[model samples]
Target chain A: FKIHAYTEGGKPLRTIYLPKLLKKVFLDVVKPNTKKNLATCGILCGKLRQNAFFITHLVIPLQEATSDTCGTTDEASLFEFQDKHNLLTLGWIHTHPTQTCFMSSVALHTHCSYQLMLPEAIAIVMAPSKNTSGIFRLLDPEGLQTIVKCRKPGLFHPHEGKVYTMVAQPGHVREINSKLQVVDLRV
Target chain B: MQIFVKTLTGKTITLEVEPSDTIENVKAKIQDKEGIPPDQQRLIFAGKQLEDGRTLSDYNIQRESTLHLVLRLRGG
Candidate 1:
C-alpha cells in the first residue's frame, strides 16, 4: 500500500508503501480482543526506497498489556530478530481497541518519542471500536521539538505547554498486495 | 571515576563523575554535550530514578555502570 505522508500544510511529503499481507496481520492480531480494552503492539520493519519506505514485515513482541497500556519486555529478542533479518525498525503500531484512533499522551511520551528518533518514524493507531485508524507523526519544528523537550512521563493533557500534534496523513498512504518472501520466525 | 550513559536514541557516552557528584551535576554534563536540558532528562540507574539531589554514591553508581537516560514531558 502507498501511504503519502504530508506536511502540516497538507502537501504530500513522501509515500509509505505497506503490503496487504502486513495489513492483514495487523488487523487480525488486534481485532480479536477489540471489546476487552486490552492493547496489542507490534514493530514495523522495512527499508527506505527512493521516495518512500516499503514496510514488508511485522514483529509482535512479548508484551505486558492492559486496557490502557502496552509494553514489550523482550527487547533482546526484538533486536535479534531485526539483526537476523537485516530489517530497519521503522516505528511502532498499536490498537486503541476501544477508543477512537488518536495518539494518547502516554503514547507520545513513550512510543512515539522513540520512533521520532528517526526522522521517518511514524506511529500507527488502530481504533477498531470506532472503525477509525490513522498514520501519524509528531509535527516538525513545533511538535517534534516540543516532545523532545518534554520531561514528564505518563498520560497528560495534550494541551499542556506546546503540546505536539499527531497529524493524520490519510491521503498520503497507499496499499499494495505484492508478494513478500522475507519472513522471520523469531517474532 | 568514569560511568557510561545511554541516551534514548542508543547513543552511549562515557563521562568522568566524582563519587560526590549529584545526579543533577551529571545531567548538566550531559546537557552540555547532548543539548537536552537537565529538567527534561530522567536518569535511571538500576531501575531507580537518579534524583537530582542524590549523589553518585548515594545510588552506589560506580565506574563502568550504565545509566539510562529518558526524556520526560508533563501530561494530564
Candidate 2:
C-alpha cells in the first residue's frame, strides 16, 4: 500500500518524513565544516512503514571532495551496509557549506536523477554558512520525467521544459524516539 | 563465455565467464573491477532482474550480451 500527501486540489505530493533527531545529527555533522567550504554527503536510509516511507538512519560514506563537490568512492561498503540493515536508500543529503542551498543543474544531471529512480527519493541541501536549507524533489510529470530522459553528460543549463521542484511538507517531520545507529562507511 | 557489463554511469566492462557461473559469482567479479558490491548490483538481463542463484544458462545470457548494471544506492 503506497501512501503520500496531497494538496487540497487533490494533487499528489511526494513527501519524505525525516525524523527530528536525524535532522539534528545532520546539522551537527555539517555545521562545523561550513567554514571549510567543502561539501559533505551521505545517504538517507529508511523503510516503508504503514504505507509511508520513514527515514530512520543516516549513512556517512567515505567521499572524495572539493570545495564545490563531494562524491562517494566506497560504494561497496555503502551497499554492504544497506544489505545488512535491509533498508531502502531513501535519498541523499548534502551540505553546500559556503554557498546558498539549491539543487544545482549539475546536481540535477548527475546525482538527483539517480536518486529519483525511487519515486519517493528527495534531495536535501544544507547551507550552514547561509543558515538556509531545503528538502526538494523533482516535480513528477515534468521534472522527474525530463531528468530521466536527459542524456547530457556534464553541467548544463536547466531544461527548456517547465521542470519544477517540490518542497516536502513541513508537517511530515517527526521525532525519532528509537535508538538509531549512524552507519559510518569511512572505515 | 563473455558479456559486456554496462554501469549506470555509462562505464562498460567486458567480463569472461562460464555458462555455469551464477549471477552472484559474476557480481563478485564486478565488485573486484568496479568496486560496486554484489548486493548493490542490480543485474538486468532481458529487462528482468537476474536472481543471484541463477546461472547464465538459466537466463540464456550469451557472449556479447549487454547486462545493464544499475547501482542500488540511497543517493545519486
Candidate 3:
C-alpha cells in the first residue's frame, strides 16, 4: 500500500497517496545511487477521532539513481518538515528499482532502528519494476522475529496503475476506548 | 499517584495509583480493559519502551504524577 505499482486487478490491496505535487518533488529532486543520499518528509493529515483512519499508508517518492546522500538528507529533511508543519513523525518510505516487495538489508536495518521509537508507524517499500509495493507495521524488538504481512491488498487487476486498496479491522478504536476507561477508573 | 495520557485525537485517560504500581502493571491493566491483544500493545514512556516489571520508581514517577501515553496502531 505504501508504493505505486499496479497489481493484477484494478484494486490495490494497499496504496500510498502522495500528492501530485509531492510526488513530483521526490522524482525530480531525490535520486537513488551508490552514495546514501536520501530524502524524507513528514506526513500531513487531519487528526483522527479514532483508530479508523490514522494513516494506513504514506505515499513517497523514490528516485531511480543519483550520487548524493539522499537517504540521510531525506530523513533530516523530514524532521524539518515535521517541525514546520506541526505534525508528528509517523513513519518513512523509500524504493528499490527492481527488488521484490520486501525490505532490502539496508531497509530492514533502518526500519528496525526507527520503529523502535515509532513503534506504531509503518515502513513502506515501493518496487517500480514488479508493479508492486509493501507496507510493514513495526513491532517491539522481541515481539515478532520476522516481517509479517499485516495487510496485503495486491492489485485487483493487472492493468490498473492508479488504484489500490488495503482493508483491515480498525481495532485500535475499541482498544483506545477501553484504555481511556482504564485511565478514568484509576483516577 | 496518577498518570495521564492524552491522544492527539483529544481522547484523554488518567491513571491514579498506589505507590507500588509498576508500568508493566499499568500496561497490563490497560490491555485487559481495552481488549488490545498482547502482540499489539507496546507501552512506551518518554520515547522508550517500558520493560515489564519495571516499577514507577525506575522512571521517577511520583504521587499525583501523570504519564503521557501515545496510542499507536498494532498494525495496518
Candidate 4:
C-alpha cells in the first residue's frame, strides 16, 4: 500500500530504504547500556539515489549522560561529521530502557523538529525492557498542527490526541537487508 | 553579500544577505524561500549554533560561506 503520506511541504512521499538489520544491530550495540538502565541515541543518515533515500550510516554522537534522557553533548562535531559525508538527516534513533517502545511526550517534542526539517524523519524506539521495538513518525499537517502550537514547558509534558503514528503502514522507511556503517563518536 | 544554506535534503539554498543580518533574519529568509518555519530551523556554521538575535558578523560568517541547516531538537 503506497498511499501518500502526510509529509512536509505536502509533497508526495518517497521511499526510504533502511537496512533491516539496523534495528537489531543498533539494539545489540546498546544492549549493555540498556541493561544498565541507561539510554543511547544515534542519528540515521544516508544518501539520496534512484529517487529515494538509502540509509547507510548509523552515527552515534557523544552524549552528556546515558541516564533518563540521552542526548548529544557535542552538536558541532555532530554536524561536522554529517556535513563531511554530505549525508541527509534521515531520522532519529534512541533506546528507551525502562520506557516502553512508544512515543512519550518528551520524545514527541524531540522528534517534532526532525520531522519538520525532513518530512519523512522517523523515530526508532528500542525498548529492551519491553523486549520489543518500533519505528514511528509524526502524522504531519495533523501532528504538526497540534504540536507546533503547543508552548508548554517541561519534559514530562502531555500531548492530547494522536500526535504520531507508526511508519510501517504505507510508510516511507523500508527496512531492507543491506550493509550499514556504525560510527561511534564516543571514542 | 550572499551565503548558502546546505539543507537537510542535500540541496543548497542561496540567500542574499548582509553581514548585519541576524540569524533570525536568515531563518526568515529561509522561510520565505522554502516555506519551512523559523523555529524548526537551526543554522550551524563552523561547528557552532547560530543564535537568532546575533548577527552574521557577530559570528564572523563571511560571504560565500555555507551553513548547515538542521532541525532544532529541543526535547530531552
* Top-TM-score structure, candidate number: 4
Better by TM-score, candidate 4 or 1: 4
Best-fitting candidate, measured by DockQ?
A: 4
The TM-scores of chain A alone, one per candidate, are 0.78, 0.81, 0.45, 0.91
Query: Candidate 3's residue-wise lDDT over A21-120, tens digit each?
Result: 3323333332432124332322322223333233322323222233211233222332233334444434455554444555443344334433433434
Per-residue C-alpha lDDT of model 2 across residues A1-187, encoded as one tens digit per residue: 2445653335554445676666567777665454666677877788776556677788888776667777777565555566557677676788877788787765664444444345556678787778887777666556655665665665345576655464644433343465555776764
DockQ of 3: 0.07
True-vs-predicted CA distance for residue A186, candidate 4, Å: 0.9
Please identify which of the two predictions, 1 or 2, would achieve the higher lDDT against the true structure. Answer: 2
Provide the TM-score of chain B versus the true chain B for each model in turn: 0.90, 0.91, 0.63, 0.91
Q: Rank the candidates by lDDT, best first.
A: 4, 2, 1, 3
Off by over 4 Å in 2: A1-15, A31-33, A110-116, A168-180, B1-76
**What are the candidates' individual DockQ scores?**
0.11, 0.08, 0.07, 0.36
Q: Residue A7 deviation, candidate 1, in Å?
A: 4.9
Clashes of each: 22, 0, 32, 0
The digit string of per-residue lDDT tens for model 4 on A36-108 reads: 8778888888998887888999987877545568766666677778878887888878887887678877778
Q: Which residue pairs overlap in candidate 2's backbone? A: none
- If you assessed candidate 1 against the hidden native complex, which CAPRI class would it receive? incorrect
Report clash pairs, candidate 4. none
TM-score of each: 0.63, 0.65, 0.37, 0.83
